[PDB]
Amino acid sequence: LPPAPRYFQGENTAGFMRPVRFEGDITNLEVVGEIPKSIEGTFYRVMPEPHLPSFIPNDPWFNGDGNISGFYFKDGHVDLKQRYVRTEKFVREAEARRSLLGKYRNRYTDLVEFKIRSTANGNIVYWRGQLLALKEDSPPYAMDPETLETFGVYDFDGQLPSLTFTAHPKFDPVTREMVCFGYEAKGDGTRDICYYSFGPDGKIAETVWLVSPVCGMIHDFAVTENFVIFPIIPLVCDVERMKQGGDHWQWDYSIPMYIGVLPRRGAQGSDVKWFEAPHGFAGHVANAFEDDKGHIQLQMAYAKDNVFFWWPDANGKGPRPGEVEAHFANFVLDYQSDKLPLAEPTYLVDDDMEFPRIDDRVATRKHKHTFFCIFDRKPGVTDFEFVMPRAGGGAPMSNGLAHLNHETGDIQRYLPGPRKLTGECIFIPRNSEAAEGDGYVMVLLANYEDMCSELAVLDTKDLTNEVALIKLPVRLRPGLHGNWVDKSDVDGHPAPL
């Protein structure tokens, strides 16, 4: 077989990106300042973290084994529990004590035949007493919220109609439904999208099969009262390329950013309208809602070139690292309209941004608060001379959070410091009676001075000030998505406003 390296090599596993690969507990974490005693619940986050050195050189960040962190908060005390998802990949590679799964989303490069290729490293969400560890090429993996034990691959009591489950399901605060989909829903290179939803009782509600114009990456989607929206990243899959050992994804400069709109209830596949936004990269969705006119307001990160530059076009054409900026875009869509081309979006701020969060109590409805990561290149904000040599590569950089008030237009910016970078933030309602976007923000910091991770707790009253700084004595590798599960929420999700 291809030889298995016995230590990590390359930029993707250097400095702060070096895997730690620890599982277990650190209770009673060190705290500078004071954690508000009223905060009770768990911050779950997932990071890609290769358990074994890959036989694939410069294996992308997105292909690392999912490791779940839980920060358990009560009476101003916090404990860390950390455990890898027991994917088929993790278990078989652990047994063999060497890497067996090959290139990102290319089964033809695997050293053994996998049934499930999930790294379960995309997202970690709460649904009906379980954690779901999500990866958009696979079904979810169900886990115990208390122990982080893996129960196994989850098929919703045999109801799961799709081979694939999105990393970005939406939770309706009114209906208590989990609104889902999968792309490549019938296997590698298929244009089949399965749109499906589950009621709070766990019974499947919607199941609509539709066809994508191209086999494009649909990473995120949006849900309104009456519509579901599928923005397609112009990364396109050719299974014949994959069979020769090629990349799953290849940029296509010749296609628009397709935005499919489907009626949310009682629709057929043919009811989908594929609107055509100006060519660009579909980033993460903040939220979507229908205004008084009944028009969809789609608010999402949007770039004008390939953010995933490591997957260029057929002739290897694409941007360089740190060249492409994503901006907080508003797209207006009308399902009634027969005009497929969409106008350029309006931009809500000028910041290079990503990883937008709202108060999920107004998810699928009009929101007036967004929290998002920013990358400010303004001199001095990040000491690049100090950070970059310690940073490694393969992961996006954010050197602050921003809070946008959509009513007033006021922006607050949290800057952790010149030698610190942030992950995706979570929002915690102050209590069940709290106004929209009123409460606490938590965000994991990479401290490049200490080569340690920190968990910052902010009050939305003043986002510039750390109320508490939780000091971890180890590195948590830069990760992807995380979620708050409040103790006062019986189904793990907050009550509607």
Added chain:
Amino acid sequence: LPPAPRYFQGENTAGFMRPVRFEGDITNLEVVGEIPKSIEGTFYRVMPEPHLPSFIPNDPWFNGDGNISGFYFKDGHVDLKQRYVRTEKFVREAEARRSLLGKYRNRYTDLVEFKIRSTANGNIVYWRGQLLALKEDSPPYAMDPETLETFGVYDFDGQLPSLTFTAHPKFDPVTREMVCFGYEAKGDGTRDICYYSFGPDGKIAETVWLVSPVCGMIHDFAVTENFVIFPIIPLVCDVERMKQGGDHWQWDYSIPMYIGVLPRRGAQGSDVKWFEAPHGFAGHVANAFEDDKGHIQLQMAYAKDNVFFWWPDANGKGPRPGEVEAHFANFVLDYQSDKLPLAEPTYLVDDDMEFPRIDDRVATRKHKHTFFCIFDRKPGVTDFEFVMPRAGGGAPMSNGLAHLNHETGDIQRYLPGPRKLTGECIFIPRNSEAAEGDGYVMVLLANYEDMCSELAVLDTKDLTNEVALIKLPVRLRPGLHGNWVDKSDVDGHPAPL
């Protein structure tokens, strides 16, 4: 109550001495070089590591909660398992989420009444299918060698005659006995020493009660074929001082270094002879044996002043940090002699040394190989300018290992590098047929450049060369004693030569 700090403060918990307090697993550790495939067994080590910040300012290193590391070796692969001993202290402080036990060995400063005050941080040894986590003020805590689960306080099936069990029991390679003792054997300030042994079947053999001339610290002891030897450190205990909030230990410049010799079998308390070595500090025993003349050769680290300077005499008189050197001393004792004063010892090498190990296959018999820690102050060996600001305080420093051949007088010195310090080494016989001191040496390194720990594997054929360097992505806080449990040894201890 005295307020509980929510983060660690002071030199004893700064830099590399900052508690990590992690429990769990890191499997398939990164390896530079090659671990010999024939090595099969576990390296167990214990470190003091406070689980919660103390309410006692500048709490000594020796008062930290015992955390057990296990390095499990097979076919050139190694896994780390890490778990705290579930002492009464650990469990009750974990329940309270704050420190409750007060000053080192002073129950009158405790915020609650403890039955057992053990931190189980002294040593971790194998006996009859269990680990024993040792602390000289308490009985052992029994643990699972595989899972590091704590079974609880161990009383040897109700046979334990003493309130105290030494951190330095001796394993006779011929008789397969565990030879033990406890000082302060009837509680705080008592001059009672209980000498006791267990046969390989777990039945108690010897139990002799004797009286110490003073209530002095007997940290280590020595066992020969026919004698047991108790060197007393001139640190003396006054319970009346303790009741006023004073130190358990206070140096006494007016007494010799007492060395008690007792017949190993069938003795009474009154059979002990208290010989009087020149005033000095009794360091760790390498080994003792009877020569052809029947005289005891006692080989141990020996200093001329108080190594534990933080416990000075009644008027606060004592040395400064890094001032006192310990030297590899040979004391000659004759149980038959009526002359109590002993001559100054002969010195086997000139090195400032401690933590001596032998091939334990010749324990209690003539040995011709010793491995020990050294601290070379020769300029350039340690980059003090770089290390000291990152080092913290409270723990002894060693910047190399030495192998002494007692026959030839040849010394090999392992220097890990200018920005690395060592812990206590272990010796592993190459195989069951290997000559004395022939095989492998392992030692945990503190790497002050990476602020990470490393486990170095050396061949005794050439101690200057690292055969393998196991790269931990976390710090293991400087610790005390560790032991090898070879897979080929059913009772966990090597066969006699």
